[PDB]
């Protein structure tokens, strides 16, 4: 994605996610977004304020501590 | 589908947090030889980084804390 202009409505499970990128408003794009990177080598634009989005990011972060 | 582009080693060049916009985790238990943190940048040039290093752990934690507050 160059800029996310809209968001997915489909909740993903944490096991499917290998990473994320943050898009910030006024840093090249007009809205904020979390871009999830999946095990299928696809990406998904997600609403940063949604619970499931924060949940995946929290779990990814905790795993990195185990590394 | 294709096999993942494993990092085989880690950069020695520490990056400023302001240039890191995301990361992907590479896990040895998913078949690559080593664990790695693959940092993503605005230019789309990704960097292989050592998960045990302080500069890496800081940036991963910082991105995560910022996301929580968004």
UniProtKB/Swiss-Prot annotation, chain A:
S-S bridge residues: 3-29, 4-45
The domain of life for this entry's organism is Eukaryota
Q: What name does this protein carry?
A: CCL20(2-70)
Gene giving rise to this polypeptide: CCL20
């Amino acid at each position: 994605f160059d800029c996310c202009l809209g968001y997915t409505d489909r909740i993903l499970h944490p096991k499917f996610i290998v990473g994320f990128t943050r898009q910030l408003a006024n840093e090249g794009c007009d809205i904020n977004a979390i871009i999830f990177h999946t095990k299928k080598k696809l990406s998904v634009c997600a609403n940063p304020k949604q619970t499931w989005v924060k949940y995946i990011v929290r779990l990814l972060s905790k795993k990195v501590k185990n590394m």
